[PDB]
Amino acid sequence: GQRVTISCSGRSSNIGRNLVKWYQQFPGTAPKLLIYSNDQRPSGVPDRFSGSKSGTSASLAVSGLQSEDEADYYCAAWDATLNAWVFGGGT
Amino acid sequence: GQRVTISCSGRSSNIGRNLVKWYQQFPGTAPKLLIYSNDQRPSGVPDRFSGSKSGTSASLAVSGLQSEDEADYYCAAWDATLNAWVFGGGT
Amino acid sequence: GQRVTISCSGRSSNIGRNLVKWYQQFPGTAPKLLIYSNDQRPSGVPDRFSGSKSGTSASLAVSGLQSEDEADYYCAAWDATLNAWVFGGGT
Amino acid sequence: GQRVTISCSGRSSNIGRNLVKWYQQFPGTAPKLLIYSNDQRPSGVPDRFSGSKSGTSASLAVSGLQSEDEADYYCAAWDATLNAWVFGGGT
Amino acid sequence: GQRVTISCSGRSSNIGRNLVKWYQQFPGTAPKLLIYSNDQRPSGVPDRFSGSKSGTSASLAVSGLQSEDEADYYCAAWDATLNAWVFGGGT
Amino acid sequence: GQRVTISCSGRSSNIGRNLVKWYQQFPGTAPKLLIYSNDQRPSGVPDRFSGSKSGTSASLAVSGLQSEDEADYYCAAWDATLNAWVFGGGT
Amino acid sequence: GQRVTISCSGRSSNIGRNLVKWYQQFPGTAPKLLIYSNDQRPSGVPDRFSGSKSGTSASLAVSGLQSEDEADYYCAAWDATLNAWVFGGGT
Amino acid sequence: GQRVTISCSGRSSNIGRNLVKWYQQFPGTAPKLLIYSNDQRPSGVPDRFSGSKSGTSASLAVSGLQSEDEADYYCAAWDATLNAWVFGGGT
């Protein structure tokens, strides 16, 4: 008689009285990007993979006022076996 | 008699009294992008994969005021086996 | 007698008294993109895959005021087996 | 006697008193895109696939005021087997 | 005696007192797109597939004021077997 | 004695007191598209497929004021078997 | 004695007191499209298919004020078998 | 009779009375990026991988006012086996 209880909560999860007050006044933004020559050549060859930001990836992130970037991948299992029983009887 | 209880909550989940007040006043934005030559060549060859942002991918993210980017992939299992029983009787 | 209870909630899920007040006043936006030469060649060859943003993909995301981009893929299972029983009797 | 209860809620799901007040005043937007030469060649060859944004796909997303892009794929199962029983009796 | 209860709710589902107040005043939009040469060649060859945005597809999404794009594919099952019983008796 | 109850709700489903107030005042839109040469060649050859936006398809979506695009495909099953019983008696 | 109850609701379904107030004042729209040469060649050859937007299809969607495009395909089953019983007695 | 209880909470999880008051007044931002020649060549070849920010990836992150970037990958298991029993009886 096995029991497994995985209550793996996520992103802004089971929230009681949450509040996110934001404000932004008077921003002036002029984020430009200019390139004369930029050649990345990122050729990723994985075999077995499970990770979050997999990218062998030469980026260029110019941020002005706001740029929120996350990645969720919850409760994962590449190879899980939570309970087991084996018996042998081969005469 | 096995029991499994996976209450893996997600994104803004089971929320009681949530509130997101936002404001943005007076923004002035001029985000331009110019390229003379930029040739990425990202040729990703995976075999077994489970991860969130898989991309071997040379990007260029110029952000003005706001750019929200997430990725959800919940409660996943590449290979899960939660309960088991085996018996052998081959005479 | 097995029991499985997967209440894997999703996106803005089971919400009690949720509210998203937004505002945006006075934005001025001129996001242009210009390219003289940009040839990505992303030829992804996966075999077994389960992940969220699969794309080996050299993008260029210029964001003005707002650009929200997510991806949901919930409660997934590449190979799951939640309960089992085996018996052998081959004489 | 097995029991399975998968109440995997989705997008804006089971909502009590939800509200999304929005506003946008005074935007001025001129998002143009110009290309002299841009030839992506993304020829993706998968075999077994289950993920959300599958596209090996070099895009160019210029965003003005607003561009919301999600993708839902809920409660999925590449290969699931929730309960089982086996018996053998071959004399 | 098996029981299966999959109440997998969808998009704006089972909603109590939902409201989406929107407003947009004073927008001025001039989103043009011009191309001298852009030849994607995306020839995707999958074999077994179940995912949401399948497209190996180099797009160009210039967004003015608003462009909402989602994709729903709910409660799916590539190969599911929720309950079972087997017995053997071959003398 | 098996029981299956799949109340998989859909799009704007079972709604109590739903309301979508919209407004849009003063928009001026001039979204043009011009092409000197753009030849996609997307020849997708799938074998077994179940996903939502199947298209290996290099598009160009210029959006002015509003363009809403979704896709619903609910409660699907590539191969589902919800309950079963087998017995053997071949003497 | 099996029971199956699939109340899979659809699009704007079982609605209590629904309302969609819309307004649009002062739009001026001039969305033109011009092509010097654009030859897609999308020749899709599927074998077994069940998905929503099947089209390997390089489109060009210029949107002015409004263009709503969805696709419904509800409660589907590529191969479903909800209940069963088998017995063997071949002497 | 085994018991496993993994209540591995996530991001802003199980929150009682959370609040995030923000403010930002008077910012003036002009973050530009210019390149005469910058060619990264990051070609990552992993074999077995499970980590969070996998990218062998020479980036250039110029930040103006705000740029929040995280990555979540929760409760993972490259190879886990939580409980077991083995017996041998082969005469």
Residue numbers in the entry:
A (entry chain B), B (entry chain C), C (entry chain D), D (entry chain E), E (entry chain F), F (entry chain G), ...: 15 to 105
Paper text:
The misfolding of immunoglobulin light chains (LCs), which are constituents of natural antibodies, gives rise to the disease. In this study, we used electron cryo microscopy (cryo-EM) to determine the molecular structure of an amyloid fibril underlying the pathology in an AL patient with severe cardiac amyloidosis. The fibril protein is not glycosylated and encompasses mainly the variable light (VL) domain, which is typical for λ-AL amyloidosis. Although free LCs or LC oligomers can make pathological contributions to systemic AL amyloidosis, cardiac pathology arises largely from massive amyloid fibril deposits that impair the natural ability of the heart to pump and to contract.
Cryo-EM imaging of the extracted fibrils at 300 kV allowed us to reconstruct the dominant fibril morphology at 3.3 Å resolution based on the 0.143 Fourier-shell correlation (FSC) criterion. The fibril consists of a single protein stack, termed here protofilament. It contains parallel cross-β sheets with intramolecular backbone hydrogen bonds. The fibril cross-section is asymmetrical, therefore a C1 symmetry was assumed during reconstruction. The fibril helix is left-hand twisted as confirmed by map-inversion and shows a pitch of ~300 nm as well as a polar topology. The protein N-terminal and C-terminal ends are juxtaposed in the structure and form a protruding stalk. The remaining part of the protein roughly outlines the shape of a ram head. Therefore, misfolding induces a 180° rotational switch of one segment relative to the other around the disulfide bond, placing the stalk on one side of the disulfide bond and the head region on the other. There are three major internal cavities and the protein is packed inside-out or outside-in.
